[PDB]
Structures are given as structure tokens and as C-alpha cells.
Amino acid sequence: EGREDPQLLVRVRGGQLRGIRLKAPGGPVSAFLGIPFAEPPVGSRRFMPPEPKRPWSGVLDATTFQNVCYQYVDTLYPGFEGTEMWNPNRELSEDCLYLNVWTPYPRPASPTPVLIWIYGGGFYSGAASLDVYDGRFLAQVEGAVLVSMNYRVGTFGFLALPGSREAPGNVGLLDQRLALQWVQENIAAFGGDPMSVTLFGESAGAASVGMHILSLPSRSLFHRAVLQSGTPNGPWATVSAGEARRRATLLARLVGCNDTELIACLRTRPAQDLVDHEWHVLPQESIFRFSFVPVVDGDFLSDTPEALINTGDFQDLQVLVGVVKDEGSYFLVYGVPGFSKDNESLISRAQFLAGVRIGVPQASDLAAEAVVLHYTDWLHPEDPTHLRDAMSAVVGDHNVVCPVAQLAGRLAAQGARVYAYIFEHRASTLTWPLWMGVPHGYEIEFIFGLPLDPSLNYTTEERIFAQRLMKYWTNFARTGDPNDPRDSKSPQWPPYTTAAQQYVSLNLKPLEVRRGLRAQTCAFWNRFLPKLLSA
Amino acid sequence: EDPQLLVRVRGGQLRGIRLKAPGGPVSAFLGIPFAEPPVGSRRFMPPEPKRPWSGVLDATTFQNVCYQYVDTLYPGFEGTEMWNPNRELSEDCLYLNVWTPYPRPASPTPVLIWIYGGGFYSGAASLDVYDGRFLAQVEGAVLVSMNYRVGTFGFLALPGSREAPGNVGLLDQRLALQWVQENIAAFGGDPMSVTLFGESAGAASVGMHILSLPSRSLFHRAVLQSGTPNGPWATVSAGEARRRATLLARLVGCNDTELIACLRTRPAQDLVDHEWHVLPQESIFRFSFVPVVDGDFLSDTPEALINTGDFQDLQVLVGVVKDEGSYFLVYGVPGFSKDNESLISRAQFLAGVRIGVPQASDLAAEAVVLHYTDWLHPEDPTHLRDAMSAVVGDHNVVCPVAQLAGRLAAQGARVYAYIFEHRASTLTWPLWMGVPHGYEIEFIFGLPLDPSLNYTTEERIFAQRLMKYWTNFARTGDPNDPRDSKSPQWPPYTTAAQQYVSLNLKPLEVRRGLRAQTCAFWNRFLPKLLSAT
Ligand SMILES: NC(=O)c1cc[n+](COC[n+]2ccc(/C=N/O)cc2/C=N/O)cc1
Ligand SMILES: NC(=O)c1cc[n+](COC[n+]2ccc(/C=N/O)cc2/C=N/O)cc1
């Protein structure tokens, strides 16, 4: 204070922050990285809801990203950029309840709609500091205020002994909520408009967006929601209390540990230890299942997300939801024998039948067989390309595409304004093999405008496309309508309705309007497969 | 005394009639007895060979139609009456007809034996659509069609009983086949090129002869139009037969002997009267008295027999029409009538599915419903109505044909498949029914060649192709024109390629996968579903 840049000093409820002038392609952005928003959920506060960050004295340095929440680091393909980019890029620490604010520089004159990013990562990983989450471009180019919060992933954030006091579960969501509160209270200090807060996120982040939609206390904290390749409903995003309990207790067992005693013990265990074992607690060989995820606690989540979407009403809600061309593929290389990033993963019907059990771990044989039955191309039932692609499709449809359909469906049905997309563009920079197509999580860098960074080798059409997506997103943030209110030479993105089921393709090509998110196959997943469990 | 019209078969002498076919004359020997009238004590009994007769049996007129339900749902309406008996009903109806070229062909000629449909409860070999004159004249075929007992008379089985062993309508047919073997040379027929062909139940029977050992020496090729021995309707288990028999017997006021005797006492029409009360569910495309897995004629389930059989010295021509199921929707599926577009509501669809797949558990019905629902257009009646048509067609004919065509090929039979896509210009059912069950027969039999029938000339030409495929198939085991390169070729249906041709007014187009996905559902998952629940 005195010699430094007047435009980078902001006070927030917790006290004084000094941010950083960051270079974006189009010019400078204000950045306030690693702002604490909670008391470090450390020591005795492990598993506990976050507590509001106690005000600090002097100026907090908000110039660099803070610690990433303690998490499993993926090491299946070490060195590989396609997994590296998701890996923590800051120190792993339980003290990681920090959030990031990008805004134009200078900060916007008039209150500016807020985008709050919630990262995915299966609820066991992710960090708002990942390069693909860099909000400088949306800040710079769209003049948006962008906020991303770390929240506790894995056990630290989602280990629950439901009903207990010391590990009530969902605290990762509560961290998220707490940041959302933080934005309400503090965002105006940055020229953010607390009255125009959009949540967007992807994979688990989307599920988290969704759960905020579905959780009353969160509802007053944002106005519009974007769920990219994630939904709070679906087989992966939550667990029953019983399952949470069973997993928490087994994880306990596995590290050597009445809920207090158990949790107390868990709290004496080193972070790493918990991480080291978080994945041993899954009931089956699974892909796209994660150990510690939001629990249906009958608190944060009053009931199952399934119920909550089926029955709640979503009047004041505008929701942009969508999927990528290939939700499944990514998950295939991490547990489905046959699959790899290093070959074309042409599998056998055996390997498929197998992968279906892994992909749909919750399936009884009959269910699994229905899956196989549905996805087999009965012309080419032995066809490795088809089976590989089917396997992709199964995992993607089951965990992402169909829940998204269900979600957009029920949401529209219940008077929410829903825009739907399928993002069909494969980053020209993608390092995954062509077979994986546009895999889970690979629209994010476009939404964020990474292509705008010339030093990132994206093609010029990827820059144009990036701005387009950024337009959509920020338009949607701004108005609850991704559409450019002026510009109408460009085709409209109709709301997804139950009657029309319209959604747009997001390619390099202009918006193509399609009907039915896998309407047919999703009938299978959303309508039939449930009934096949009931017997 | 035209000696062309004069044949001596084993049983004595026949006087045929010289019939005019559009391109010349044919010898028709109609009303030829091939079994002792299955009357009186003989009712429900296997047919015994007709006793020899004195003098010259007038064989110029069709004989009685086997005693069957006459359909009344739309009286006077050509669309239904065309299937109704066009002769006097009578249990005394074990006669076959032979058309031949006139003159009697010089060299032994491939015989096609037609087995009519009629759900095993009706049909007759005298109906115009089974007129063998065209195939005799145009294609030089010796064409035989028998009557075989239908309904209770042909198929009321008290399995294991002496006096209603079951499958006697099939035995009737087997007898006609023996009769052809024993007699057809006398007509110029080649008892070494006998091709059975038939539709609906006529196909199931054709298939049942494929599946029945005694029948195998009685034909070489088989053509199964729009029906199969496998599948939901063509057979019943012994227990279900017994059940329906005993039930029918209850309904007409009656150990097996003591019961059959009583059924024996009953005027035909009394049996026919109650023939329908005996279906376990409010069904469609389900018939009360059908061949029974008796462990005898059918040593095991057609599925068992088609899964496990060896079929490598067998050629089969199988196919379906575009709308197998539609026809059946008007006969018990609320909301369907030939007298509107039958645009149904979602509810009527879920309902018209427990009637179409009557044996479905709610789960299986739901399975069917979710499968057939166009989720882009979930409530659009045009779809629901077509899906209904589809459900019933696929369930009953298409997919059964699929499994059959698949199993036969797998197990070494040479198989040709088709989907018949041409709707007759003269069709009397409304358009929404498309190409209903049964409506390729007119074409195969070459009826469009009779100019007085007001078939378009493009249909005349089509009929001719079909007759040519069928008779080529009859001649050679291969429907393809054995000299004629300007194609395309009808490839054998194989389990790999699953190729089959559309028969329509365009040239053959080869499609692959006979509703592969949908039949997957029907032939793979549905069994598993009910096979648990
Ligand atoms: N802690 C866990 O539950 C866990 C940890 C690691 N994996 C495997 O990491 C592979 N991987 C890598 C990236 C993603 C994407 N997440 O949004 C998902 C996955 C999981 N597939 O089953 C699964 C579960
Ligand atoms: N005896 C019976 O089981 C019976 C009698 C009459 N019908 C009604 O006739 C309508 N109909 C008319 C023609 C056909 C075609 N058969 O190949 C089939 C059907 C049956 N649909 O459920 C059905 C069963």
C-alpha cells in the first residue's frame, strides 16, 4: 500500500487483499488468487463443515493460487499432458479452502455478473487453479467476474458418517456454499454483482452446481446454473447415507479405526493415508464411480437428487446443461481391460461384456445384459471398433448423457429455463487418441477461452469458437439466455423443452439445433434400467 | 374327354379341369382327396390315407373348406372376406389341388406345395390368392395346395392321448406331402424337387415340417412367408394344449378318451363357437389351437429344434411384409380400426401391448413400451399406432423370422430373406396398415397377371419377378435368375452379413440386419426378462 498498483487492492469481509495484474491476450486482468474463504479445515476441523474465514490483518497476498485440497494425484499415465492438466498444480494441503477472483482491469465500473466455477474431478480431485480453469480470458474478453473456489475433495470433503456431528458429509459442498456466500458478501468489492451469480462447473463440479440448485440454503446464492457434463442425479454423483456410512467406515477400517471415536481417529490419520485408501472403498470394480461424493444426508440434499428433480419446482431457474461428444471414453482407459490411450482400444465382445459390468457396476446381470443388449450393434456384434465405441457410449450415456437428459428433462418439465448443448469439438491440441473423440472435460478449456492464448497452439477457428462459447456462457450468465440479444444472423439456441428436446451442437460450425439427447438410449437408462433394479 | 385333364394317381383316376390363365391354359386337379374324411370317430385323429376310388373322380372343383371360424368382424369387406372360406365348410375337407401346365409338362417339374395361413384356425387352399394357375402357366410349376384341418379339428390336442394326439392338421399336411411324393410324377411334378411354401400359419407349418423328421423326406426346399415354427404363436406346449382342449371341452359340456368322445359328439360349429373362449389372455396374433410341442411331430420346442438342428442340406426362403402386425390390431386392440387412421393415445399403446405381447409381465410390457416409444415423439399417435403395428409384427413375425433365418443359417441351411414392401394398389385396408400380413401372397401367386384384377401394370411385372424368385427358388434352391446378370443379386441371409432383399416395385435392394436391434430385444432380452422377473 503506497508504492503498489492502486487497482489491485480490494478489501473483502475478511480484510484487505492484494491481487495481481495478469496479462491476457486482449490485455490485463485483475486477479485475486488464493483468497481464504474458510478457516483451514485442518486438524480437528477435518470432515467438518467449513467455518467462515476469520478476518486477517494487513494485506493478504492474493497474487498466487493457494494450496490444492488434499487429493489423489492420477498417475496412470505419468508425464502425459492429458492427465497432467488435471493434476494439482499447487501444493496439496488440507488447508486449501481458498478461492480465486478474476475481473477486468481496471475492475468493472458497473456491477458485473459473476461466474462461479466449480471444478470437477470426481469429488476426489480438482483445484480451481488448474490451467484450464484460468478465468483471465472470460474476465478480459467478456468482462466477466469469475470466481473459482477450491473445495475439499475426497474423504476430506465428502467422507460422511451420516447423522454424526463430526462428519456429517457433504462438506465439500458446504465449502462450495461457503464460497458462494463469500461471493454474495464480497464480490461487489470486485465489481461483481452478487445479484447476478451463475454457477458453472463440469463433471463433479456440475453435479455440485446441481446440488446447489437442489439445496435450499444454496439457492439464494446464485441465480443461474450451468452443468457441464455432470448432474446431481445419476449413479455417481451421490451416495446413500448407508453407502457413505459403509464407505466411511471401511475407509476407517483400512487406516485402522460410535462415530466420534472413528472420526476422531480419522482426524489423526495423515491426509495422504486417507487418500491412499479412499479408492479401496468402492463396492465394485468401477469406472466413473468415486468413493466419497455428496451424500444424500436429508440435509444438504433433502432427498435423492432423483426425487428432488422429479418433484421440486424450478421457476426462477435458468440452466445451461450439456455434454461432450464422448463422455465415456476418458473413463475407459482407467479400469476397463482392453482400453488404453496408446492403442485404438479395439476390444472384444468379451472385453465389452466385462467393461459393461465395470461401467455399470451397480447392474445386476439382467441389467448388465440389457445394457449389452442395447449397445451391441447386432449387425456387427463382435466388431471391436463398435464395441469400444459402445463401451464409451455406455459409460458416457450412463453417467453423463442420460442423467443430463433426465436433468434437463425434469428441470424443463418443472418450469426451469433449460439450454442444452452437446459439445462436439475435439481440441486440435488434444493429446488423447482420436478414438476417445471429445472426451469428458474437454470443452472446459474452450468455455474458459484457453484457445485465445496464442501461446497455446489452438487453431484460429478454435479461437473463434472459444469466443463463441464464452459469448454463450457469459450471455447465459448475464441474462439466462446464451443467445446474443442483438446478433441474430447467427442461429438461435432454443431452450430445451420436454416437447421439442432441442439442444445445440457446439462445433466449429455454427449452432446446429438437434432434438433429443439420446432420447431413445436415455429411455433405456432413465426409464427402463431403474425398473430392472425393481426386480 | 381331354386326356390332359385325366390323371391316374395311386388312388385311381382324376378328371381335372382346363382352366384359362392369362397367357394360356392350365390343368387344374382340384378337390383331390388325400385322406379319409376326418369325420366322426376320425375327428381329432391323424388323417389316414384316402381309400382308392372307382371310376374317375371329378377333380374339377375345389372341395369343402375345413371347418373353421368364419370371420365376421367386417362383413362384406373384401379385405377380410378374401380370407374367409370360399367353399362350404365341412370337416370333410382333406383334399388337395394340383395345378399344372397345360399340357402336363414333358419333363419332371419342380412342385411348389402351398400351405395356407389362417392362424391354424382358418384358411383354405381354394381362396383366390392361392390360385396356382398363374404359377403353373407362367412359370411351369406344378403347384399343390392341400386343405388341412384347422382349429380344434386340426389342432385340439390332448397330448399323450390316443384320440387327440394333436398336430393332425400338420399330419394332414404331411399326408398331402406324401401324396405329392407318391402321386405328383403322374402330373409331371418332380417329387424330387418339392418346395413347400406357405404364409403365417402356413409358414409355421412349412417350418414345422422342416423341424419334423418324418416330413423331411417329403420336400427339399421350404419357403416361409411371414411366419415361423419358432415364436410366440405357432406352437403351444403340451400342457397349454391339454388346457385349452379341456377348457374347450368344458365350454361345450364335456380321462382323455371319455372327453374326446364327447368333443367328437359335438357339431363342428359348437367347437368353433368356443374355439376362441380358450385363449388365456385377451390376445392378438395368438390362436387357440395350433401345433403342439407334443414330443412327437415336434420332438421339442421349435426354438429347441432350430437352435440344435442340422440344416445344411436345406434351402429356405424367408421373409416378412412391411407391416406384419397392422392387420392384427383391428381384432382386439382398442383404438384400431380399418375405418379410421387408428391414431392411438399413449395409454392405448401400453394397453395394446399387453394384448400384443399378452404373455408379457408388466416389466416386459414396459420393456416393449419403452423400446417402441419414439422418445422424440412419445405421445404422437401416428408413431404409437405404427409402434403398435411394429410391436405385433416384430414380436410375432419379423423377429421370429429373424431368429429362424439366423438359426437356419448358423446351422448350415442356405437362407434367403426378404421384406415385401409393396402395398397392393388394390388393397382394401387403409394406408396406415401399409403392407399387412398376408398381402404378398397375391403377388407371389401371380394374381396381378389376371388383368381383370385391376393391379397396375408395374405390379403385373412385380408379380412376375416374385413368381420368378419363388419358382427359381423352387427349381434351384436359389431365388436368383440363373441366367440374367442385370441384377442386383439376392444374397443368402447369413449370420454375419444378415443380408436380405426388399421385394417392392424397385429392383432388389439388399438390406442388412432384419430389424437386428429390435429383434435383439425380442429374441435375446425378452426371453432373459421373462426367464427371470
Ligand atoms: N478416489 C476415488 O474415488 C477415485 C480415484 C481415482 N479414480 C480413477 O481416476 C481415473 N479418472 C480420471 C479422471 C476422471 C474424471 N473425473 O471428473 C475420472 C477418473 C475415474 N474413473 O473411474 C477413480 C476413483
Ligand atoms: N380360433 C382362434 O384362436 C382365433 C379366431 C379368430 N381370431 C380373430 O381373427 C382375426 N384374424 C384374422 C386374420 C389373421 C391372420 N392369420 O394368419 C389373424 C387374426 C387374429 N388376430 O388376433 C383370432 C383367433
Which region holds residue B12: left if phi is over 0, alpha if psi is between -120 and 50, else beta? left
Q: What angle do CA B409, B437, B304 make, to 5 degrees?
A: 35
Enclosing H/E stretch for A71: none
**B163 is annotated as an active-site residue:** no
Q: Which of B122, B126, B200, B288 is an active site residue?
A: B200
- Closest ligand to the CA of A87: 1
Three cell numbers, residue B218: 417329403
Q: Do A528 and B367 touch (CB under 8 A)?
A: yes
Q: Which of A364, A365, A375, A378 to mutate to test the interface with B (most CBs of B within 10 A)?
A: A378
Which residue from A256, A182, A253, A158 is spatially nearest to A12, judged by alpha carbons? A182
One DSSP character per residue, B212-223 reads -HHHHTT-SEEE
**Inter-chain contact A373–B521, Cβ cutoff 8 Å?**
yes
Q: Which of A373, A379, A515 sits opposite B513 (nearest CB)?
A: A379
B514 chain-A contacts, CB cut-off 8 A: none
CB contact under 8 A, A527 and B498: no
* Cα A22 off chain centre by: 25
Closest residue by Cα to residue A406 from A338, A296, A308, A271: A308
Q: Does B516 touch chain A (CB under 8 A)?
A: yes
| Paired strand residues for A112 | A192
Beta pairing, strands B509-512 & A512-515: unpaired
Q: Which residues pair with A147 in a beta bridge?
A: A101, A116
Give chain B's end-to-end CA distance (angstroms, integer).
69
Distance from CA of B499 to the nearest CA of A (A): 10
Q: Is the sign of the CA dihedral B466, B472, B478, B483 positive or negative?
A: negative
The shortest CB-CB distance from A531 to any of B363, B376, B498 is to B363
d(CA A327, CA B231): 39
DSSP-assigned letter for residue B305 = H
Cβ of B520 and A376 within 8 Å?
yes
- Which atom of ligand 2 is closest in space to residue B200's alpha carbon? 17
Three-state DSSP class for residue A293:
coil
Ligand 1 center to residue A85 CA distance, Å? 14
Q: Which three cell numbers stand for residue A239?
A: 451416495
**Alpha-carbon distance B381 to nearest alpha carbon in chain A (angstroms):** 14
Cell 447415507, residue located: A241
| Distance separating alpha carbons of residues A430 and A433, to the nearest angstrom | 8
Nearest by CB: B375 against A377, A523, A531: A523
Residue A13: which of A179, A205, A245 has the closest Cα? A179
DSSP-derived letter for residue B95 is E
What is the DSSP pairing of strand A192-202 with strand A224-228? parallel
Residues of B in contact with A523 (CB under 8 A): 370-371, 373, 375
- Of the candidates B363, B376, B517, the beta carbon closest to that of A519 is on B376
Give the chain A residue nearest B377 (alpha carbons): A499
- Å between A130 CA and nearest CA of chain B: 39
Mutating to test ligand 1, I would choose from A69, A71, A73, A74 the residue with most ligand atoms within 8 A of its C-beta, which is A74
Which residue(s) pair with B223 in the sheet? B197, B317
A280 touches chain B (CB under 8 A): no
Segment 373-402 of chain B within 8 Å of chain A by CB: 373-376
CB atoms within 10 A of CB A256: 10
Atom in ligand 2 nearest the alpha carbon of residue B289: 3
Q: Cα(B148)–Cα(B171) distance, rounded to whole angstroms?
A: 8
**Exposure letters A497-526 (e unless 16+ CB within 10 A, then b):** eeeebbbbbbbeeebeeeebbbbebbbbbb
DSSP code, position B143: E
Q: Which amino acid is present at A249?
A: T
Q: Which cell goes with A520?
A: 431413445
SS3 A221: coil
Write out residues with Cβ below 6 Å of ligand 1: A 72, 74, 120-122, 124, 154, 203-204, 278-279, 287-288, 290-291, 331, 334-335, 440
For residue B298, the one-letter residue type is L
Q: Are B152 and B66 in contact (CB under 8 A)?
A: no
Binary contact (B498, A379; C-beta < 8 A): yes
Q: Pick the residue whose CA is nearest to atom 1 on ligand 1.
A: A279
Q: How far apart are CA A12 and CA A31, in angstroms?
A: 14
Say which experimental method was used.
X-ray
Q: Is the peptide bond before B488 cis (omega within 30 degrees of 0)?
A: yes
Q: Does residue B136 sit at the A interface (CB-CB below 8 Å)?
A: no
Instruction: Residue A379: list chain B partners with CB under 8 A.
Output: 498, 512-513, 516
A501 interaction partners in chain B (CB closer than 8 Å): 376
Q: How many CB atoms lie within 10 A of CB A396?
A: 28
Classified as helix, coil or strand, B472 is: helix
How many other C-beta atoms are found inside a 10 Å radius of the C-beta of residue A280?
13
Q: Determine the straight-line distance between the first and last CA of chain A, rounded to whole angstroms.
A: 68
Are the beta carbons of A535 and B363 separated by less than 8 Å? Answer: yes
How far apart are alpha carbons A353 and A348 in whole angstroms?
A: 8
Chain A residues whose beta carbon lies within 8 Å of the beta carbon of residue B366: 528, 531
Decide if A528 and B366 are in contact by the 8 Å CB cutoff.
Answer: yes
What DSSP assignment string belongs to A331-372?
Answer: HHTTT-TT--SSS-----HHHHHHHHHHHSTT--HHHHHHHH
Q: Of B164, B150, B153, which Cα lies nearest the Cα of B121?
A: B150
For residues B131 and A309, what is the distance between their CA atoms, to the nearest angstrom? 63
Ligand 2 atom nearest B290 alpha carbon? 3
Min distance B474 CA to chain A CA atoms (Å): 29
Q: How many residues does chain A have?
A: 535
Question: Residue written as cell 441389467?
Answer: A367
Active site residue B437: yes
The rounded Å distance from CA A115 to ligand 1 centre is: 26
Q: Which three cell numbers stand for residue B191?
A: 417329387
Q: Identify the architecture of domain A1-535 in CATH.
A: 3-Layer(aba) Sandwich (3.40)
- Ligand nearest the Cα of residue A444 is 1
CB B288 within 8 A of CB B295: no
Contact criterion met (CB < 8 Å) for A378 and B532: no
Are A124 and A207 in contact, with CB atoms under 8 Å apart? no
Given strand A98-104, what is the order of strands in its sheet? A20-24, A27-36, A98-104, A145-149, A112-118, A192-202, A224-228, A318-324, A417-423, A502-506, A512-515
User: Cell 433405456 belongs to which residue?
Assistant: A524
- Please check whether residue A501 touches B, CB under 8 A: yes
Report CA torsion sign: B76, B81, B87, B88.
negative
Best substitution site from A330, A399, A442 to test ligand 1's pocket, by max atoms within 8 Å of Cβ? A330
CB–CB contact B532 A366 (8 Å):
yes
- Give the HSE-up count for residue A437: Cα atoms under 13 Å, Cβ half-sphere: 23
Which residue's alpha carbon is at the smallest distance from atom 5 of ligand 1?
Answer: A279
Cis bond upstream, residue A384 (ω within 30): no
Q: Measured between CA atoms, how close is B368 to chain A, in angstroms?
A: 10
**Residue B226, all three cell numbers:** 411371414
The secondary element (H helix, E strand) that includes residue A185 is helix A171-186
Q: Which one is catalytic: B139, B240, B275, B324?
A: B324
Looking at all shown ligands, the one closest to residue B439's CA atom is 2
CA of residue B524 to ligand 2 center, whole Å: 27
Domain ranges of chain B: 1-533
Residues in the ligand 2 pocket, defined by CB under 6 Å: B 69, 71, 83, 117-119, 121, 151, 200-201, 275-276, 284-285, 287-288, 328, 331, 437
Instruction: Give the bridge partners for A38, in sequence order.
Output: A52
Architecture of domain B1-533: 3-Layer(aba) Sandwich (3.40)
Backbone angles phi, psi at A4, to 5 degrees: -90, 180
Catalytically active residues of A are 203, 327, 440
Residue found under cell 422342416:
B210
Name the phi and psi angles at B421, rounded to 5: -115, -5
Burial zone of A413 (CB within 10 Å; 0-12 exposed, 13-18 middle, 19+ buried): middle
B422-429 contact pairs (CB < 8 A, 24+): B422/B459, B422/B462, B422/B503, B422/B504, B422/B505, B423/B322, B424/B455, B424/B459, B425/B454, B425/B455, B425/B456, B425/B459, B426/B453, B426/B454, B426/B455, B427/B79, B428/B77, B428/B78, B428/B79, B429/B79, B429/B326, B429/B327, B429/B338
Question: How far is the C-alpha of B319 from the C-alpha of B397, rounded, in Å?
Answer: 9
